[PDB]
């Protein structure tokens, strides 16, 4: 089961420098960005 | 909350590294895919030794540190192993996203008496009340 649907950590990912990066080209599945974790360059 | 579950909660066993966990490279159904066109050049080119889809260790760290290229176009994403059984075609986040696979048919096996095939089915101005076509979305 999707624990983020029953818990909702509501984690927002905002880098201090956004240049060479991408994003999920699906508003519906954009929740996967707040269902996992990010990376630090 | 209709049909909700996470297949990636506990599937199989094995030993993996907690540090070796990427957060990108998921080539799932999240882009406007198209057929395209086959373009060949004046130079044959080997094309690189072709392999199989049954790749055991399918990793993809992606050195997103020493430079990079930001693309706003569609070419900013490229799905791989979606024409068959791909280990990456099940990395889906939501439980509902079976848009990662292709189902073909099967031909009879050799070593049989009597050449029994399938009817050629040649419609001749009948016009059935059943038009259109459908694809097949299978698991991974």
UniProtKB/Swiss-Prot annotation, chain B:
Cu cation binds at residues 2, 50. This is Alpha-synuclein. Changing residue 57 to K: Increases oligomerization. Belongs to the synuclein family. Residues 20-67 are annotated as: 4 X 11 AA tandem repeats of [EGS]-K-T-K-[EQ]-[GQ]-V-X(4). Highly expressed in presynaptic terminals in the central nervous system. Expressed principally in brain. The modification N-acetylmethionine is found at residue 1. It is found in: Cytoplasm; Membrane; Nucleus; Synapse. Sequence repeats lie at residues 20-30, 31-41, 42-56, 57-67. It is linked to Genetic alterations of SNCA resulting in aberrant polymerization into fibrils, are associated with several neurodegenerative diseases (synucleinopathies). SNCA fibrillar aggregates represent the major non A-beta component of Alzheimer disease amyloid plaque, and a major component of Lewy body inclusions. They are also found within Lewy body (LB)-like intraneuronal inclusions, glial inclusions and axonal spheroids in neurodegeneration with brain iron accumulation type 1. The gene is SNCA. It comes from Homo sapiens. SUPFAM superfamilies: Synuclein (SSF118375). InterPro entries: Synuclein, Synuclein_alpha.
